[PDB]
């Protein structure tokens, strides 16, 4: 069934699984027309497909051309997501195919279930965790590749950089979920935290700065402070 706090261990076991987040697939800017009506202009999006155990991110870039001449785009986006995830699975060798795909929003269950009927042995699951994957476009290098794309394109990243050399996947996913939750609640402050120190750089082949273990503890503490703060700032506590 669904995926909740009772089973954190299953995320980091040796059964291949992927999280799928469709929240950045269909992205628009809303503006006024010359006549004073409102219209949307779509911008490039992405499907965020993540192996939580290995950190492999399958970033499918959704070029705005895919929406041309189409109706009911928010419904189509869920089916387009499903179609691209199914295409990804079929492209992987059998031994790399996932045994479970967990969708971060329940509206994806039926579109994905229907696209994956050829794969009856892959479980399609919802989750109750409130995962902050929508903030993935707050990661500069991810945003950059999506915005620059001129055509449909898949780009492969490791969202954990080299962290698994030193920490476990339960800790890497926890750090990623923490950075992303912070970037989602106050992007400016989150980003100031990550970059205040000019001497800690982001390697060309990485997404996040090269923090030592001590510096990550300080960083992680600061993101908690931020999340807790904003939460007071929000409710007045």
């Amino acid at each position: 069934g669904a995926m909740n706090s009772s089973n954190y261990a299953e995320l980091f076991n040796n059964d291949i699984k992927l999280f799928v987040d469709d929240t950045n697939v269909y992205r628009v800017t809303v503006h006024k027309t010359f006549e004073g009506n409102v219209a949307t202009k779509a911008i490039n999006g992405c499907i965020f497909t993540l192996n939580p155990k290995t950190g492999h991110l399958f970033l499918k870039i959704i070029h705005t051309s895919v929406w041309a001449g189409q109706k009911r785009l928010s419904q189509l986006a869920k089916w387009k997501t499903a179609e691209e995830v199914s295409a990804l699975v079929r492209s992987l060798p059998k031994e790399e195919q996932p045994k479970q795909i967990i969708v971060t929003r329940k509206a994806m269950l039926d579109p994905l279930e229907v696209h994956m009927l050829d794969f009856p042995n892959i479980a399609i699951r919802p989750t109750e965790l409130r995962l902050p994957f929508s903030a993935a476009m707050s990661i500069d290098k991810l945003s950059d590749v999506v915005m620059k794309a001129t055509e449909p394109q898949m780009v492969l990243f490791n969202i954990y950089d080299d962290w698994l050399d030193r920490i476990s996947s339960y800790t890497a996913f926890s750090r990623l979920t923490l950075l992303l939750r912070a970037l989602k609640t106050n992007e400016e402050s989150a980003k100031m935290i990550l970059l205040s120190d000019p001497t800690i750089t982001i390697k060309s082949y990485h997404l996040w700065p090269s923090f030592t273990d001590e510096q990550w503890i300080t960083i992680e503490s600061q993101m908690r402070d931020l999340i807790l703060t904003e939460y007071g700032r929000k409710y007045n506590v």
């Binding site: 189509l76 089916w79 499903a82 179609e83 039926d110 579109p111 279930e113 229907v114 696209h115 009927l117 050829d118």
Partner: protein
């Protein structure tokens, strides 16, 4: 006008004949049912006074043979049988009518209810859903499960309705996933109507039979089948206009005949609210919508 004679009534039982029913007391001098209209399938059904568990019954057509009921004290039920000696049977019946030991099938002349509930139901099709080929009549009861129910355990005692499953490869063409899932016309018209049922009359006959088994026996899988067949039409953007118009009539008489106090378990809120208010055909079922709103506004 045909007759279904009873050998006797050894145990107290409510007997149903189509949409009619009457109470027979233990060892009361009851010898069956006369004046049964020819030209329709019928169902004769039973609920023992002492065990309201298991409603059970027999679908039959008096044109297909001479049938009678006889209680079996070993198996504990009223059993339908066929009498092949035509002369022995007329002679039995005539003695029981002379001594007036039969109830009269009580059809009011204005009343088309039964015809309207069974318009497309044929005995030959029933016998393919209920597989027991040595007999010309078909037994159904409350507990029988459907072939599809068994896939999700006795095959000989299953209801072999046509499997409908909206998230299946049969229903969804490769490359038309979204289109076929949101507009099931392909699945209705090509897969089911042209490929499996051949015509809408067979479709409607199975739909009507499912409802009647759901109503008379509270057979849960029949109710699932009836709702699935309604939903497949309503979720199709492209339906022949005569089918829509006939569906409206079919469902209207079904909803009209349902006991008021059973609406809570025989009617799926989700299917009905979708069919009448969300689906492509939301505006095509005027009679059904009007009776549903005036009789079961709660559900909606």
């Amino acid at each position: 006008m045909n007759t279904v004679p009873f050998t006797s009534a050894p145990i107290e039982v409510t007997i149903g004949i189509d949409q009619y029913s009457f109470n027979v007391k233990e060892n009361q001098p009851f010898h069956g049912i006369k004046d049964i209209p020819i030209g329709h399938v019928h169902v004769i059904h039973f609920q023992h006074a002492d065990n309201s568990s298991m409603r059970y019954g027999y679908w039959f057509d008096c044109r297909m043979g001479n049938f009678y009921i006889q209680y079996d004290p070993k198996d504990g039920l009223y059993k339908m049988m066929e009498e092949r000696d035509g002369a022995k049977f007329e002679n039995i019946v005539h003695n029981f009518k002379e001594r007036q030991m039969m109830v009269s099938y009580p059809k009011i002349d204005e009343d088309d209810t039964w015809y309207n509930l069974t318009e497309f139901v044929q005995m030959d099709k029933i016998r393919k859903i209920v597989r027991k080929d040595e007999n010309q009549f078909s037994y159904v009861d409350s507990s029988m499960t459907t072939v599809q129910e068994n896939e999700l355990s006795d095959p000989a005692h299953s209801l072999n309705y046509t499997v409908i499953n909206f998230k299946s490869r049969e229903a969804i063409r490769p490359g038309h996933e979204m289109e076929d899932f949101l507009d099931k016309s392909y699945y209705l018209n090509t897969v089911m109507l042209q490929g499996i049922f051949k015509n809408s009359s067979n479709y409607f006959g199975e739909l009507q039979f499912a409802f009647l088994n759901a109503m008379f026996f509270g057979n849960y899988g029949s109710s699932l089948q009836w709702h699935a067949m309604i939903e497949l039409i309503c979720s199709s953007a492209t339906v022949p206009k005569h089918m829509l118009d006939k569906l409206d009539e079919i469902l209207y008489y079904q909803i009209k005949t349902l006991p008021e106090q059973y609406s809570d378990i025989l009617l799926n809120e989700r299917v009905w609210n979708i069919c009448l208010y969300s689906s492509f055909q939301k505006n095509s079922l005027h009679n059904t919508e009007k009776i549903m709103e005036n009789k079961y506004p709660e559900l909606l």
